[PDB]
């Protein structure tokens, strides 16, 4: 879906499989966190479905030793003195010592400030211990978390449930047309993006000889040249668009290992899984009622949450019993208007827009005479190939960007019995729609319930309307205070700040690095996990936020600003929390998840409609839903569901006929599935018979 998804997938630790265990053989104990996973496996990133705990992600600093156990690094403490000596320990090796938590106060020389320090001890025992007892200590605070997990700002303020959801949904981010790095980061974005491998890094230092949208040539210092080709509009495994763009320009000096071109969900080499949106935390006329989301049509107009999706369509021409299927533009009983977009071969041409149902590849297959309906044979007499063209499935639409044709006639090695093969690539440019699913990094998820016009949005003092409106009620229940903090810092990063340096450094910012006391608008910052911005420093920064271009400070030191109802004009009675939050477009879009069926295929054996949108199937009326029906006492609806609307071979046909005729719905027949049941019970030497009220067996 996006580079982070691939990276995590490559760093997965699965318990299932041969030699391991079966899913039916995994108790509540294999799955829950173990004290030995510290620094080795992440206790956050794990599915919440039936595979919870069976699939972990490797911790950040974890490595594997040649024996197979997962080693993690620790700093050796000599005599109450922290050393830069780093040794990797296994689990049982670690248990034979005592290690201190990363965030222990340390002297500039190495000695511990407090005599008592937090310490982990054998068997997963946590307690305080004298400074003279510490053998090793943690490398970094973020030593226990996964790559994804370490990308959650203010993670230390989110509950494990919403944090799991956030780390799992970051992997469902959809690459946007254009990618913006987040204002509020954690430091992991850079190395996540680079190590993910979907960007282009320079192997050796040099200068850029010639740069094009197609390729980038680097003239090394020694004299050699290396050319990196960009991957442009390539179809990902999951229909997301992988598209790399050059960053450097012609004649630019670039060092070894620098990012010269970044790919999807990347910006100057950092993971850009979403966009920075102006957020207002208030209820708004019920359109954001529990976890729904309201968006400004700006995001539609300026393609802010637009993303590309590429579908692959495929058809072949085989040898049949009565001849061979031929791909041809000449199709029986097809107007010249639908065939207008096809080339001479019956293949659609590049650049043609195609709706669902249009022809893409014209293939006709010869049908035998003994396979014709009596009405079909009459209609043939009263007026030998049938239509098997590749049509666009329902719900798909886009520009045809690429074609690929393989012909057994033209050397192309195909499976035996295949003469031609055509693959058509269709790209759709999906704007953000009602019902598309957005989410933040703290498991704060929702769907788009309303996209209002830019003038309706509650707008700030200087007229700038907000972009997204989050309901308040679904915030303090979930315990994802992260976003709150994230929001505030968000604003601080957009406007910047200037701390009052005169009369000394204020007492709250004493611990801040000197680089943070002044910041220009749209500044980039990092909240490292379990380190980073403390609430006090954030309070201060809200106190020293920069004014706008007109010299006005729009947000209060509490973090709230005054907004105006774009619909009535009156200002809203109270101040509202306004800020900037990083929102990601998750890969659960209505364009894919909508479906509907009148009629369609039926399984041969059971004669019940197929399943799945891709097979044009119907929804399943399960046992529980049947109990619901029986509860209401809707007898006729239940019967109609389980007969004429399903596997009543003659009843469904007569229903279709009665609908097109305008007549009444007929009387349901017997389900063919029950006939199947009877024949099976007979196959088990059980003599089942249906008796009439008189007692005679009926057939």
């Amino acid at each position: 879906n996006n580079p982070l998804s691939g990276l995590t997938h490559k760093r997965r630790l699965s318990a299932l499989g041969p030699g391991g265990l079966s899913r039916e053989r995994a108790g509540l104990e294999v799955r829950d966190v173990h004290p030995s996973h510290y620094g080795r496996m992440c206790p956050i990133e794990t599915p919440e479905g039936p595979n919870i705990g069976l699939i972990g992600s490797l911790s950040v600093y974890a490595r594997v030793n040649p024996f197979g156990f997962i080693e993690t690094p620790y700093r050796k403490v000599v005599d109450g003195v922290v050393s830069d000596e780093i040794v990797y320990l296994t689990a049982d090796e670690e248990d034979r010592h005592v290690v201190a938590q990363a965030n222990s106060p340390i002297d500039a020389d190495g000695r511990f400030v407090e005599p008592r320090v937090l310490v982990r001890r054998k068997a997963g025992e946590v307690e305080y211990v004298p400074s003279s007892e510490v053998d090793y200590m943690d490398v970094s605070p973020r030593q226990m978390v996964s790559v994804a997990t370490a990308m959650i700002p203010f993670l230390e303020h989110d509950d494990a449930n919403r944090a799991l959801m956030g780390a799992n949904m970051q992997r469902q981010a959809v690459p946007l047309v254009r990618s913006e790095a987040p204002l509020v980061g954690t430091g992991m974005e850079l190395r996540a993006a680079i190590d993910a491998g979907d960007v282009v890094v320079a192997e050796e230092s040099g200068v850029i000889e010639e740069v094009s949208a197609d390729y980038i040539t680097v003239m090394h210092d020694n004299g050699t040249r290396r050319t990196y080709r960009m991957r442009k509009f390539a179809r990902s495994n999951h229909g997301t668009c992988a598209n790399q763009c050059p960053i450097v320009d012609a004649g630019d000096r670039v060092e070894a290992g620098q990012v010269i071109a970044d790919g999807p969900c990347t910006d100057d080499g950092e993971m850009a899984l979403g966009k920075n949106l102006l957020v207002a935390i208030m209820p708004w006329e019920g359109h954001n009622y529990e976890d729904a989301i309201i968006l400004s049509n700006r995001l539609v107009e300026e393609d802010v949450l637009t993303s590309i999706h590429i579908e692959e369509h495929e058809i072949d021409a085989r040898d049949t019993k009565l001849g061979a299927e031929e791909i041809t533009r000449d199709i029986p009983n097809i107007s010249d208007e639908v065939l207008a977009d096809l080339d001479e071969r019956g293949i659609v041409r590049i650049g043609a827009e195609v709706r669902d149902g249009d022809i893409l590849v014209g293939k006709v297959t010869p049908k035998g005479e003994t396979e014709l309906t009596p009405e079909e044979r009459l209609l043939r007499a009263i007026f030998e190939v049938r239509d098997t063209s590749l049509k666009v499935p329902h719900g798909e639409s886009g520009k045809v960007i690429g074609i690929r044709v393989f012909s057994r006639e033209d050397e192309d090695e195909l499976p035996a019995g295949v003469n031609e093969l055509v693959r058509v690539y269709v790209a759709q440019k999906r704007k953000i729609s009602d019902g598309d699913k957005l989410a933040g990094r703290h498991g704060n998820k929702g769907v788009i319930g309303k996209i209002l016009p830019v003038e309706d949005m509650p707008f700030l003092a200087d007229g700038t309307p907000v972009d997204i409106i989050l309901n308040t009620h679904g915030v303090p229940r979930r315990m994802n205070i992260g976003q709150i903090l994230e929001t505030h810092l968000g604003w601080c990063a957009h406007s910047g700040w200037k701390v009052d340096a005169a009369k000394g450094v204020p007492d709250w910012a004493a611990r801040l690095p000197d680089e943070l006391l002044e910041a220009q608008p749209n500044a980039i910052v990092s909240t490292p996990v379990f380190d980073g911005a403390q609430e006090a420093e954030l309070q201060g920064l809200l106190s020293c936020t920069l004014p706008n271009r007109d010299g006005d400070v729009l947000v209060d030191a509490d973090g709230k600003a005054m907004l105006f109802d774009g619909r009535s004009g009156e200002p809203f009675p109270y101040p509202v929390t306004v800020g900037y939050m990083y929102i990601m477009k998750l890969h659960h879009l209505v364009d894919d998840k909508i479906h509907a069926r009148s009629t369609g295929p039926y399984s041969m054996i059971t004669q019940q409609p197929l399943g799945g949108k891709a097979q044009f199937g119907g929804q399943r009326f399960g046992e529980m839903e049947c109990w619901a029906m029986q509860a209401y006492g809707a007898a006729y609806t239940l019967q109609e569901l389980l007969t004429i609307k399903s596997d009543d071979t003659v009843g469904r046909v007569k229903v279709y006929e009665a609908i097109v005729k305008g007549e009444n719905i007929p009387e349901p027949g017997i389900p063919e599935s029950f006939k199947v049941l009877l024949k099976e019970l007979q196959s088990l030497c059980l003599n089942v018979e249906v008796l009439s009220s008189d007692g005679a067996a009926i057939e």
């Binding site: 950040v60 600093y61 690094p73 700093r75 830069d84 780093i86 990363a102 965030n103 490398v139 970094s140 605070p141 790095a181 980061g185 430091g187 992991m188 850079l190 190395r191 680079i194 890094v201 670039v254 060092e255 290992g257 620098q258 990012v259 100057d268 080499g269 950092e270 611990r511 801040l512 690095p513 680089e515 943070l516 910041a519 500044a523 980039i524 910052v525 990092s526 909240t527 490292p528 380190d531 980073g532 911005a533 403390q534 420093e537």
Partner: peptide
């Protein structure tokens, strides 16, 4: 400064603890 190794954008960190080993 955060991630001062490849040539990346200067993202400033609220870091209080130093990184003795890079990822």
């Amino acid at each position: 400064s955060n991630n001062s190794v490849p040539g990346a954008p200067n993202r400033v960190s609220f870091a209080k603890l130093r990184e003795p080993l890079e990822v």
